Design a protein around this ligand. Structure first.
Ligand SMILES: [Zn+2]
Ligand SMILES: [Zn+2]
Lengths: 114, 836, 63, 99
C-alpha cells in the first residue's frame, strides 16, 4: 500500500523540518501575546536566524546592502555571502559601478542575524 | 451647462446629467452648513462621482478640470497620450490619491451635518448634488421640520453612490498616521496585534455613523449572504489602514507527545475579518492521515522553518525563502517538425504575398520570467463597490442560474477526470493527485470535507511556466493548487458545475460542443426573437489579474446559493472562508519561496470558468443598469421602460428588501432586449439596436465605464467588435470565426479557426510527440477536424489548408467508413447535425 | 524567403540550449532575447542581421 | 546530435552572404570569441591563425567580416603586446578586435 509510503514521507518531512524550527525566539514571541495567537507573517520576520536578499541591479544594492552590515526588519544583519545567479561565489570587492555590467544579476545576499 | 444630478420624484428618477425656507434658521450653528443669504465652488461631489463612474476619453473635460483646479496635477500632464490607463502609466493612481483627503474631509462634514439635523428634528434625503467639493452643504429644499432631537436623515443613495471612489482615491490614508494627520509619522502598530475589531468600529462610527444597516466586523456573526456582502464590502475599505503583516493565517503552538508544532488556528481576512477554528486540540497524539494532510499543507510549518526573505524584484509582500538557493526556471524553444514544413513548401505554401503565414511560435523565456510575470499582480487593487447596486445585481444574476440544480454530494458519487494534475506544494513531491485519491478512503474524504465545513485550511499553490504555442511574447504561467483544496471544492461544487455544463439553450454555454450543429444551435439561441438586432462583443483586459475581491466573493456567494437544504449559514460561511483563503489570497510557491496573492483568480482551479461566467454576467447586468439609470427620464417616449427605470431606482436606493416581482420583470426585459451567450470570459450579445441608440440597454461605452470604475482596468475599442449585418456570424468567439454556408438544402453557421494558428501548431510540436508515430497522426487528425470548415471559405488559399492536412494524414497512414479518418467524409459528418 | 529564417532560428536556439548555454545566465538572456526578437520580425533584413548574432553565439564556442 | 546536420543543411539553403562568409571564415579556424554588435559599434575579438590568408581579412587597416566593415584601433596577439607588420616570428592567435 503506497498510502504507507506517502504517510511515512509526510511524517519524515514534518519531523526533519521541526529540527530547524525552535529558535527560542518563538517561545518568547508567542507567550508575549494573549491567547498565544500571532500572525504567521511575523514568525520569520522576528525569529529566522538567516536573511536572503535578491538584488536585481546595482542601484538597489547601493541603497540596501551598504557595507558588510545593514539594517532591516528593525534589526542588524551582517553579510555572510554573495552569490550570483549561477551559484558562483562573488566577492564584495567586485561589486562596483564600473564592474557591474560584468556581474550576472540578480545577486543572492545571504546574511546572519547579529 | 450640463450638470450631474441624482433626481427622484414621482415623475422622473435617475442619476444622470441634466440642464440647470426657514430650515436654514435651525442649521447655521453647524459648521458644515454653507452660509446662505455664497462662497460656493464650481463643481459638486455629484460631478466628481459622475465623471469617475461614467468615464470615456474625449468627453472627460470635467474630470481633467477638477484635477487641475485642486492642484492634483498640472495642465501639461494631459498631453502625454494614454494617461488614464491603469496598466500603462499606473502613476495616475498617485494623481487620484491627491483627491483622497478632499474626499475624506467631505465625509467628516456629512457626519457633522446630519448631527445638526437630528438635533433640529429635520427629516429629509441628502444627495451628492447638494454638497460642495469642499464639503459644505446647501439647497434646503425637500426638508420638513419635526420635534427637535428626533430629526432623521437618509444617506442610503449618498453613501452607496460614493462608495466606488472611496478606495480609488485612497481617502482613508490619513487614518494610518498618528493623530490622523498628513505631516506626522506612521502609527507604529504592534506586530503581534491582529484583531482591530474596535478600530474597525471606530472607523465606522467616525465616517458612517448614520448608515442605517448594521455592520459586522467579523462576518462569522452575519445573518445571510446579503449581510456577508455588506459587511465584507465595508471590511475591504477598513482593511487598507492596518499593517499588511497582520493578515494571513493565525498560528498557535500545540504539543504532540511533547514536541511543539506551530499550526494555523484561524485566519485574518481583509474582507471577512477574524475567523477562528472550532475543532482545535492543543494536545494530541498519533496524528492520523487527516491531521497529517492538513498540517503539512498549511503555511504554518513552512514560513517558520524557512529563512526571512527580502525580494527587491517584485513589490508583492514576500514571506519566506524555503530553500538556501534561489531557483531560476527557463522554458525551452519548441521543437520543429521538418517533414511537415518540407511538405508544405513542396505544395506551394509560404510564398511571398500569401494570405496565410507563420505567426504562432513556442516563444522562449529566460530565467527572470516567472517572477516578472508574477509581478503582474500589481494591477489588483482593493476596490470597494456600490453596495445597493451590487445587492440588486446579485439578485438579477441568480435568475440566470435558477435553471440548474446544486447540492453538496458524497465522496463515492464523484467523477474525476485526468487525475494527473499538480497536487500543489508540498504534495507534488511524492506524486500526482492520483496517488492521494487511491490512498485516502471514502470516509476519509467525507471527514476532511466536514472538517472544512467547520475550520479554515489555508493552502499553498505552486506557480510554474507552461510549454504552449502563442502569437504573443508573454510567459503564460500555470497555477497548481493543493489537493486539500481540490478535493473539497469538487465535493462542494461538482453537482452544480455538471448541471451548468449539461443544459443547452441557457446564457452560459460552457460544456457544449460545436460539432453536430452545436455552433448553429447556440447562435440561433442567441438570436431568439430580438427586434432590430445587432451583435456585439467585448474583451477583458488582465481578467485573471485585476478581478476584484468583492466580485470574486459575490461570484462564490452566487454559486453557493444552491446550498439551502444541505448546510447552514455558518457551514456556508466556513465554506466561503475556506475558498477565499485557499484560492483567492493564499500563499504562492514561486521559485523556491513564498509570496502572498493580493487577489485574482487561480487558473488551475476547477471552479474558474464558471466564476468568470458569473462575473461576466454581473458586469453585463451592471452595464445595463447604469445605462438605464443614466438616461434622461423626460426624453424617453415609451411608457413602459420609463416606469421600469422609476421602479429600478426605487428598488436600488429606496427599497431595502428584495422585490422579487421586479427581479423577474427586469430579467425578462433584459432577456427580450439584450440576449447573451456567455463562456468563461468571452461573451457575445444580440441586442436591440434601436433601444441601445437611446440609452435603454448597454452600449460598449457602458461596459468601458463599468470596467474603469469597478474592475480597475481600461478597455479599448481595438478588441471590442460590433456587427450590423446578422447574416455573418459573430466576429470572434472562443478563438473561432463564424461563416454562413449552404449545405443540406438549407443555411447553417459553421465555425472556422485562423489557418495561421493551425499551420503553426502543425509545424511546431511540444516534443511529447516526436518519439511516437501515433500521437503525431492523432494530432494531425485533430487539426484536420478543426480545419475542415475552411473548405467552404471563399478564399482558395484558405481552402487548400485542409487539403494539405488531409494529404498529410494520408501520407502518414501510408508510411505506417465512419471509423476511417483518412478520407474527407469522416470530417464532413463531424459537422452535420445528425448524431460521437 | 522569410519563413525559413524564423524556421532555422528555432533549431539554432534548440541546439544552443542543448550545448548547455542555458547554464550561463547572461548568455541565455541575450540568446532568447534576440530569438524572440526575430520571431516578431516583419522585415527580412533585420531577421538576417540578428540571425548573424545567433550563429556567432553558436560559433564562438569550440563544442 | 542529429541537429547540426539538420541545422547547417538549412543554413546553406538560406543563401545569405552575411552567413556563408562567416561559416567559411570560421571553417579553417578564424572564429570570433564574442558576439558581433548590430548597433553601438561594440568590440569583437576575432582570432586568426598564423597568416590565415590575412589579405582576405584586412586591407589598409580595414577589417572585412560578415559582409561588414570594421575599423581597427587595437591589436593584441598571444604575446599580449601590439605587433606591427618577418612573418614566421609570430604566435598562432591574433586578436584584431575593432569597434
Ligand atoms: Zn453582517
Ligand atoms: Zn450545501
Amino acid at each position: 500500500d503506497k498510502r504507507a509510503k506517502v504517510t511515512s514521507a509526510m511524517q519524515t518531512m514534518l519531523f526533519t523540518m521541526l529540527r530547524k524550527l525552535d529558535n527560542d525566539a518563538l517561545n518568547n514571541i508567542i507567550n508575549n501575546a494573549r491567547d498565544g495567537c500571532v500572525p504567521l507573517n511575523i514568525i520569520p520576520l522576528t525569529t529566522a536566524a538567516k536573511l536572503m536578499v535578491v538584488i536585481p541591479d546595482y542601484n538597489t544594492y547601493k541603497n540596501t546592502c551598504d557595507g558588510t552590515t545593514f539594517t532591516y526588519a528593525s534589526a542588524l544583519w551582517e553579510i555572510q555571502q554573495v552569490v550570483d545567479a549561477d551559484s558562483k561565489i562573488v566577492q564584495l570587492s567586485e561589486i562596483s559601478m564600473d564592474n557591474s555590467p560584468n556581474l550576472a544579476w540578480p545577486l543572492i545576499v545571504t546574511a546572519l542575524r547579529a | 451647462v450640463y450638470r450631474a444630478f441624482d433626481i427622484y420624484n414621482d415623475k422622473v428618477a435617475g442619476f444622470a446629467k441634466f440642464l440647470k425656507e426657514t430650515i436654514y434658521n435651525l442649521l447655521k450653528d453647524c459648521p458644515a452648513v454653507a452660509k446662505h443669504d455664497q462662497r460656493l465652488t464650481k463643481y459638486t461631489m455629484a460631478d466628481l462621482v459622475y465623471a469617475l463612474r461614467h468615464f470615456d476619453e474625449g468627453n472627460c473635460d470635467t474630470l481633467k478640470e477638477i484635477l487641475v483646479t485642486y492642484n492634483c496635477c498640472d495642465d501639461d500632464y494631459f498631453n502625454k497620450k494614454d494617461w488614464y490607463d491603469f496598466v500603462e502609466n499606473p502613476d495616475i493612481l498617485r494623481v487620484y490619491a491627491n483627491l483622497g483627503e478632499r474626499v475624506r474631509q467631505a465625509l467628516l462634514k456629512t457626519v457633522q451635518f446630519c448631527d445638526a439635523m437630528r438635533n433640529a428634528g429635520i427629516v429629509g434625503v441628502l444627495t451628492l448634488d447638494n454638497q460642495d467639493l469642499n464639503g459644505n452643504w446647501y439647497d434646503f429644499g425637500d426638508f420638513i421640520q419635526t420635534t427637535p432631537g428626533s430629526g432623521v436623515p437618509v444617506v442610503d443613495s449618498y453613501y452607496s453612490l460614493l462608495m466606488p471612489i472611496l478606495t480609488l482615491t485612497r481617502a482613508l490614508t490619513a487614518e494610518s498616521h498618528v493623530d490622523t494627520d498628513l505631516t506626522k509619522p506612521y502609527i507604529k502598530w504592534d506586530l503581534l496585534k491582529y484583531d482591530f475589531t474596535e478600530e474597525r468600529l471606530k472607523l465606522f462610527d467616525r465616517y458612517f455613523k448614520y448608515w442605517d444597516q448594521t455592520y459586522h466586523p467579523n462576518c462569522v456573526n452575519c445573518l445571510d449572504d446579503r449581510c456577508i456582502l455588506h459587511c465584507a464590502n465595508f471590511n475591504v475599505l477598513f482593511s487598507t489602514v492596518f499593517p499588511p503583516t497582520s493578515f494571513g493565517p493565525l498560528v498557535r503552538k500545540i504539543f504532540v507527545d511533547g514536541v511543539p508544532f506551530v499550526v494555523s488556528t484561524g485566519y485574518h481576512f481583509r474582507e471577512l475579518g477574524v475567523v477562528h477554528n472550532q475543532d482545535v486540540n492543543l494536545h494530541s497524539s498519533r496524528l492520523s492521515f487527516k491531521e497529517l494532510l492538513v498540517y503539512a499543507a498549511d503555511p504554518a510549518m513552512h514560513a517558520a522553518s524557512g529563512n526571512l526573505l527580502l525580494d527587491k524584484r517584485t513589490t508583492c509582500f514576500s514571506v519566506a525563502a524555503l530553500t538556501n538557493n534561489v531557483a531560476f526556471q527557463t522554458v525551452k524553444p519548441g521543437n520543429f517538425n521538418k517533414d511537415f514544413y518540407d511538405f508544405a513548401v513542396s505544395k506551394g505554401f509560404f510564398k511571398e504575398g500569401s494570405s496565410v503565414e507563420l505567426k504562432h511560435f513556442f516563444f522562449a523565456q529566460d530565467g527572470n520570467a516567472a517572477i516578472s510575470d508574477y509581478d503582474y499582480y500589481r494591477y489588483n487593487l482593493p476596490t470597494m463597490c456600490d453596495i445597493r447596486q451590487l445587492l440588486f445585481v446579485v439578485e438579477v444574476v441568480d435568475k440566470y442560474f435558477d435553471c440548474y440544480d446544486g447540492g453538496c454530494i458524497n465522496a463515492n458519487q464523484v467523477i474525476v477526470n485526468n487525475l494527473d494534475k499538480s497536487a500543489g506544494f508540498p504534495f507534488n513531491k511524492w506524486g500526482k493527485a492520483r496517488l492521494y485519491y487511491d490512498s485516502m478512503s471514502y470516509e476519509d474524504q467525507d471527514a476532511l470535507f466536514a472538517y472544512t465545513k467547520r475550520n479554515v485550511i489555508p493552502t499553498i499553490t505552486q506557480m510554474n511556466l507552461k510549454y504552449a504555442i502563442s502569437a504573443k511574447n508573454r510567459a503564460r504561467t500555470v497555477a497548481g493548487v493543493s489537493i486539500c483544496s481540490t478535493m473539497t471544492n469538487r465535493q462542494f461544487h461538482q453537482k452544480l458545475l455538471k448541471s451548468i455544463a449539461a443544459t443547452r439553450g441557457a446564457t452560459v454555454v460552457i460544456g457544449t460542443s460545436k460539432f453536430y450543429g452545436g455552433w448553429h444551435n447556440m447562435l440561433k439561441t442567441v438570436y431568439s426573437d430580438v427586434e432590430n438586432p445587432h451583435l456585439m462583443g467585448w474583451d477583458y483586459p488582465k481578467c485573471d489579474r485585476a478581478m476584484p475581491n468583492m466580485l470574486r466573493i459575490m461570484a462564490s456567494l452566487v454559486l453557493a446559493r444552491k446550498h439551502t437544504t444541505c448546510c447552514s449559514l455558518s457551514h456556508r460561511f466556513y465554506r466561503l472562508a475556506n475558498e477565499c483563503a485557499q484560492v483567492l489570497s493564499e500563499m504562492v510557491m514561486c521559485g523556491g519561496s513564498l509570496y502572498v496573492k493580493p487577489g485574482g483568480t487561480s487558473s488551475g482551479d476547477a471552479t474558474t470558468a464558471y466564476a468568470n461566467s458569473v462575473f461576466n454576467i454581473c458586469q453585463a447586468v451592471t452595464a445595463n443598469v447604469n445605462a438605464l439609470l443614466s438616461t434622461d427620464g423626460n426624453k424617453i417616449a415609451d411608457k413602459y421602460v420609463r416606469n421600469l427605470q422609476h421602479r429600478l431606482y426605487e428598488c436600488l436606493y429606496r427599497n431595502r428588501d428584495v422585490d422579487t416581482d421586479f427581479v423577474n420583470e427586469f430579467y425578462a426585459y433584459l432577456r427580450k432586449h439584450f440576449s447573451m451567450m456567455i463562456l468563461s470570459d468571452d461573451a457575445v450579445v444580440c441586442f436591440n439596436s434601436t433601444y441601445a441608440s437611446q440609452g435603454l440597454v448597454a452600449s460598449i461605452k457602458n461596459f468601458k465605464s463599468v470596467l474603469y470604475y469597478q474592475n480597475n482596468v481600461f478597455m479599448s475599442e481595438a478588441k471590442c467588435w460590433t456587427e450590423t449585418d446578422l447574416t455573418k456570424g459573430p466576429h470572434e468567439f472562443c478563438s473561432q470565426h463564424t461563416m454562413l454556408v449552404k449545405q443540406g438544402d438549407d443555411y447553417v453557421y459553421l465555425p472556422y479557426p485562423d489557418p495561421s494558428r493551425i499551420l503553426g501548431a502543425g509545424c511546431f510540436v511540444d516534443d511529447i510527440v516526436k518519439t511516437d508515430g501515433t500521437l503525431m497522426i492523432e494530432r494531425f487528425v485533430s487539426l484536420a477536424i478543426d480545419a475542415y470548415p475552411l473548405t467552404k471559405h471563399p478564399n482558395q488559399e484558405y481552402a487548400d489548408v485542409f487539403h494539405l492536412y488531409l494529404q498529410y494524414i494520408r501520407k502518414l497512414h501510408d508510411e505506417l467508413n465512419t471509423s476511417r479518418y483518412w478520407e474527407p467524409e469522416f470530417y464532413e459528418a463531424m459537422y452535420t447535425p445528425h448524431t460521437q | 524567403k522569410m519563413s525559413d529564417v524564423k524556421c532555422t532560428s528555432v533549431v539554432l536556439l534548440s541546439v544552443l540550449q542543448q550545448l548547455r548555454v542555458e547554464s550561463s545566465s547572461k548568455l541565455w538572456a541575450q540568446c532568447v532575447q534576440l530569438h524572440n526578437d526575430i520571431l516578431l520580425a516583419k522585415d527580412t533584413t533585420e531577421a538576417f542581421e540578428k540571425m548573424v548574432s545567433l550563429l556567432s553565439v553558436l560559433l564562438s564556442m569550440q563544442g
